[PDB]
Design an enzyme around this catalytic site. Structure first.
Site, short mmCIF file in Angstrom:
data_model
loop_
_atom_site.label_atom_id
_atom_site.label_comp_id
_atom_site.label_asym_id
_atom_site.label_seq_id
_atom_site.Cartn_x
_atom_site.Cartn_y
_atom_site.Cartn_z
N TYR A 180 0.82 -1.21 0.00
CA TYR A 180 0.00 0.00 0.00
C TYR A 180 0.86 1.27 0.00
O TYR A 180 0.36 2.38 0.04
CB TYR A 180 -1.01 -0.04 1.14
CG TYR A 180 -2.15 -1.01 0.90
CD1 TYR A 180 -2.58 -1.31 -0.41
CD2 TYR A 180 -2.80 -1.64 1.96
CE1 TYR A 180 -3.63 -2.22 -0.64
CE2 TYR A 180 -3.86 -2.54 1.75
CZ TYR A 180 -4.27 -2.83 0.45
OH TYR A 180 -5.30 -3.72 0.24
N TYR A 181 2.18 1.08 -0.08
CA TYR A 181 3.13 2.13 -0.46
C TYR A 181 3.21 2.37 -1.97
O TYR A 181 3.51 3.48 -2.41
CB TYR A 181 4.53 1.77 0.04
CG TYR A 181 4.69 1.90 1.53
CD1 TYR A 181 4.29 0.87 2.37
CD2 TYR A 181 5.24 3.05 2.09
CE1 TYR A 181 4.44 0.98 3.75
CE2 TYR A 181 5.38 3.18 3.47
CZ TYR A 181 4.98 2.13 4.29
OH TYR A 181 5.12 2.23 5.64
N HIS A 223 -4.23 7.06 -1.72
CA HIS A 223 -3.93 6.75 -3.11
C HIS A 223 -4.77 7.63 -4.01
O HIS A 223 -5.78 8.15 -3.57
CB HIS A 223 -4.27 5.28 -3.37
CG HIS A 223 -3.33 4.32 -2.70
ND1 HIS A 223 -3.51 2.96 -2.76
CD2 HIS A 223 -2.19 4.51 -1.99
CE1 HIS A 223 -2.52 2.36 -2.11
NE2 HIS A 223 -1.71 3.28 -1.64
ZN LIG Z 1 -5.23 1.98 -3.38
#
Ligand SMILES: [Zn+2]
Length: 289
Positions: free
Chosen positions: A18-19, A146
């Site tokens: 999730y980086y 994101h």
């Molecule tokens: Zn995402």
DNA sequence: GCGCACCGAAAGGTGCGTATTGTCT
């Protein structure tokens, strides 16, 4: 929109990645949250190394690895992903038109929602064969904001990864009893909505509310929204090819439509992508005021 | 979960199932 996913050992790969959709982002994309996080000395930017440890139930101070009591015939649980997604028009205004205050609007609404999720954090304690359920009021959360969809559309969303750990009243760390957070998903999604509306309203946007109690920025219509919802269009096509009515599909049919309608997709120059959004929004006649 | 069977070591703790909107890990 708010969804949850229980995370297990097989998901440890994606949870820690999730980086990945974030280095090219163009906006403090990782952040710790929670009284539990505070208790553990965790603050600000999420350290990838420590996130992995925590995912693996290693508090690492002096104490032993959490969750040994997990049965072998069952899956070890590594956390709880709560993924908060803005309405399309909101992503559009933040990421195409470039309004940084909307990012903050989104972040606050996530942070405020998470606090209400945290009030619901629970653990068990057994004493002399008697099991009690205790509200601990503390979570450890790594939040990963994101900006893009799997089809590369503007898609402002945050993965709030709740670690499977909470501090009991007696000072003992335990796996999270997740019932109250999980069953409150819809209630939490409406809190995110209310807090986000409130924030956007203070910036001077007007909101058009919909059928579902969702909303979009008043000045961006449905066709414009759909021109920037490619995944939605791919799901809609899946259904129609199978002759299914979106109104009554089973879970299996829904999950199939979402998962299997996905294309195999590369990385891309983010400076180049932005310009493409802007040219795309012009094509769709979008006036960002 | 609708209290259980099986985890490791504590007359203790865990997953299990939970959910269900759209913008669509
Ligand atoms: Zn995402």
């Amino acid at each position: 929109m708010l969804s949850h996913m229980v995370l297990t050992r097989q998901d440890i790969g994606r949870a820690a990645s999730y980086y990945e959709d974030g280095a090219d982002d163009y906006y403090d994309a990782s952040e710790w949250q929670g009284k539990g996080a505070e208790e553990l000395g965790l603050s600000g930017e999420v350290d990838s190394k420590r996130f992995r440890e925590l995912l693996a139930g290693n508090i690492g101070e002096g104490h032993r690895i959490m969750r040994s009591a997990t049965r072998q015939d069952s899956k070890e649980r590594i956390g709880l992903d709560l993924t908060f997604s803005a309405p399309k028009s909101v992503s559009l205004q933040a990421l195409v038109a470039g309004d940084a205050e909307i990012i903050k609007a989104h972040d606050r609404a996530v942070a405020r929602t998470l606090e209400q999720a945290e009030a619901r954090a629970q653990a068990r304690q057994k004493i002399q064969g008697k099991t009690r359920i205790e509200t601990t009021g503390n979570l450890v959360i790594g939040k990963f904001r994101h900006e893009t969809s799997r089809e590369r559309d503007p898609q402002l969303h945050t993965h709030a990864v709740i670690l499977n750990m909470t501090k009991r009243s007696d000072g003992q760390w335990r796996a999270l009893k997740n019932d109250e957070i999980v069953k409150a998903t819809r209630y939490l999604g409406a809190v995110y909505n209310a807090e986000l509306a409130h924030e956007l309203q203070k910036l001077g946007y007007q909101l058009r509310y919909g059928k579902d109690g969702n909303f979009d920025l008043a000045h961006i219509d449905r066709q414009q929204i759909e021109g920037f919802s490619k995944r939605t269009e791919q799901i809609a096509e899946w259904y129609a090819a199978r002759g299914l009515d979106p109104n009554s599909v089973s879970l299996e049919q829904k999950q199939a439509a979402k998962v299997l309608s996905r294309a195999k997709k590369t990385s891309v120059d983010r400076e180049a992508l932005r310009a493409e959004w802007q040219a795309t929004a012009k094509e769709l006649g979008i006036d960002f005021s």
